[PDB]
Design a protein around this motif. Structure first.
Motif, short mmCIF file in Angstrom:
data_model
loop_
_atom_site.label_atom_id
_atom_site.label_comp_id
_atom_site.label_asym_id
_atom_site.label_seq_id
_atom_site.Cartn_x
_atom_site.Cartn_y
_atom_site.Cartn_z
N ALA A 182 9.99 14.56 -8.05
CA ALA A 182 10.79 13.39 -7.69
C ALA A 182 9.92 12.31 -7.04
O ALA A 182 10.06 11.12 -7.35
CB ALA A 182 11.92 13.80 -6.76
N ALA A 183 9.03 12.72 -6.14
CA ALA A 183 8.14 11.79 -5.44
C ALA A 183 7.29 11.02 -6.42
O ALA A 183 7.21 9.79 -6.37
CB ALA A 183 7.25 12.56 -4.48
N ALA A 184 6.66 11.76 -7.33
CA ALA A 184 5.81 11.19 -8.36
C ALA A 184 6.63 10.28 -9.26
O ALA A 184 6.12 9.29 -9.79
CB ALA A 184 5.17 12.32 -9.18
N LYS A 185 7.91 10.63 -9.42
CA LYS A 185 8.80 9.82 -10.25
C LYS A 185 8.97 8.49 -9.55
O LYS A 185 9.05 7.44 -10.18
CB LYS A 185 10.16 10.50 -10.40
N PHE A 186 9.00 8.56 -8.22
CA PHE A 186 9.15 7.37 -7.42
C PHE A 186 7.94 6.46 -7.62
O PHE A 186 8.09 5.25 -7.77
CB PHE A 186 9.26 7.74 -5.94
N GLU A 187 6.75 7.05 -7.63
CA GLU A 187 5.54 6.26 -7.80
C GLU A 187 5.47 5.60 -9.15
O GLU A 187 5.15 4.42 -9.26
CB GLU A 187 4.33 7.15 -7.60
N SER A 243 0.84 -1.19 0.00
CA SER A 243 0.00 0.00 0.00
C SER A 243 0.87 1.24 0.00
O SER A 243 1.84 1.32 0.75
CB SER A 243 -0.89 0.02 1.24
N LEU A 244 0.53 2.20 -0.84
CA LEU A 244 1.28 3.44 -0.92
C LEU A 244 1.44 4.02 0.48
O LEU A 244 2.45 4.64 0.80
CB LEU A 244 0.56 4.44 -1.81
N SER A 255 0.85 -0.89 -6.19
CA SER A 255 0.09 -1.31 -5.02
C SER A 255 -0.86 -2.47 -5.33
O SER A 255 -1.05 -3.34 -4.50
CB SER A 255 -0.68 -0.12 -4.44
N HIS A 294 8.38 2.84 -9.02
CA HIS A 294 8.44 1.78 -8.02
C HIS A 294 7.15 1.31 -7.35
O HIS A 294 7.18 0.37 -6.56
CB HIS A 294 9.46 2.16 -6.95
N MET A 295 6.03 1.96 -7.64
CA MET A 295 4.78 1.57 -7.01
C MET A 295 3.80 0.85 -7.92
O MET A 295 3.53 1.29 -9.04
CB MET A 295 4.08 2.80 -6.42
N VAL A 307 14.56 3.35 1.31
CA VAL A 307 14.28 4.50 0.45
C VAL A 307 14.72 5.82 1.06
O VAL A 307 14.89 5.94 2.27
CB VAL A 307 12.77 4.67 0.16
N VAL A 340 8.05 11.88 2.06
CA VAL A 340 7.61 10.84 1.16
C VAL A 340 8.80 10.26 0.41
O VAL A 340 9.81 10.93 0.21
CB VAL A 340 6.57 11.39 0.17
N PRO A 341 8.71 8.98 0.01
CA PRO A 341 9.83 8.40 -0.72
C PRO A 341 10.13 9.19 -1.98
O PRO A 341 9.22 9.55 -2.71
CB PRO A 341 9.36 6.97 -1.04
N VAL A 342 11.40 9.48 -2.22
CA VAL A 342 11.81 10.21 -3.41
C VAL A 342 12.89 9.44 -4.14
O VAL A 342 13.31 9.83 -5.22
CB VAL A 342 12.37 11.59 -3.07
N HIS A 343 13.35 8.35 -3.53
CA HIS A 343 14.40 7.56 -4.13
C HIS A 343 14.40 6.14 -3.57
O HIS A 343 14.21 5.94 -2.37
CB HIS A 343 15.74 8.25 -3.85
N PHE A 344 14.58 5.16 -4.44
CA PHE A 344 14.62 3.77 -4.03
C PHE A 344 16.09 3.38 -3.94
O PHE A 344 16.81 3.38 -4.95
CB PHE A 344 13.92 2.89 -5.06
N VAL A 355 4.35 2.16 2.28
CA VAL A 355 5.64 2.55 1.76
C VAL A 355 5.97 3.92 2.34
O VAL A 355 7.06 4.14 2.84
CB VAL A 355 5.66 2.61 0.23
N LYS A 356 5.00 4.83 2.30
CA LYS A 356 5.20 6.17 2.84
C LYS A 356 5.56 6.14 4.33
O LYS A 356 6.46 6.86 4.78
CB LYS A 356 3.94 7.03 2.64
#
Lengths: 124, 124
Positions: free
Chosen positions: B4-9, A50-51, B15, B12-13, A108, A116-120, A54-55
């Motif tokens: 960047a966050a949206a780039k993450f989604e 779930s987003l 769900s 990598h997401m 992340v 919020v995640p910005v990099h994996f 992850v958040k």
């Protein structure tokens, strides 16, 4: 009268590498999520959690990124994830990926407010 | 300009649990291997490895069967297997299973000559 051995095969053998089901998941998903344009991104991971979860990772155990500048976070519990790795014969613009379904912890980098995640970073 | 966050989604997401292609694997397998005939076999495991390979576990490390038998053997190396367990809604004749993919050591009981698996004991 089925032999006990043969019974074992019927009940427990399936060398046809089950997981085959989603063997083209990476191939398809790596194309739709625009990550094959120009070049084939060699490696990539997908988190099917779930987003929200992850958040929530951003507030877990703080740790170093495989870089040198602190800003990464590792999940408390592991998450179903898919690993996509460019295959041997892969050649742009006809990329080819191998799909591996695993379950590991994720790391992340977070940013902004709220975080919020910005990099994996990686998994394990 | 994608954030960047949206780039993450985007990268990598996913769900929506990407295990649907395989979320109904046990249902098919429990079916065709005649394990849902008369009654739904509650628990069952599938070894996604070569037969010959498995057969060799018959000569790997020796172990005590879960009960107490002296025979049985434990693979020295883990293997790709799938876990099938009857769900809560499952009610004959409508068997419903949950699919769980894992990697681990298996424990078998061997017999006859040459020794071949004749019973699946457990795993870990």
């Amino acid at each position: 009268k089925e032999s006990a051995a043969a019974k074992f095969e019927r009940q427990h053998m399936d060398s046809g590498n089950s997981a085959s089901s989603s063997s083209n998941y990476c191939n398809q998903m790596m194309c739709c999520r625009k990550m094959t344009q120009g070049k084939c991104k060699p490696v990539n991971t997908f988190v099917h959690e779930s987003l929200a979860d992850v958040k929530a990772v951003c507030s877990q155990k703080k740790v170093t990124c495989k870089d040198g500048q602190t800003n990464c976070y590792q999940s408390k519990s592991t998450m179903r994830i898919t690993d996509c790795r460019e295959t041997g014969s892969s050649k742009y613009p006809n990329c080819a990926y191998k799909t591996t379904q695993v379950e590991k912890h994720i790391i992340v980098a977070c940013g902004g407010k709220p975080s919020v995640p910005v990099h994996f970073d990686a998994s394990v």
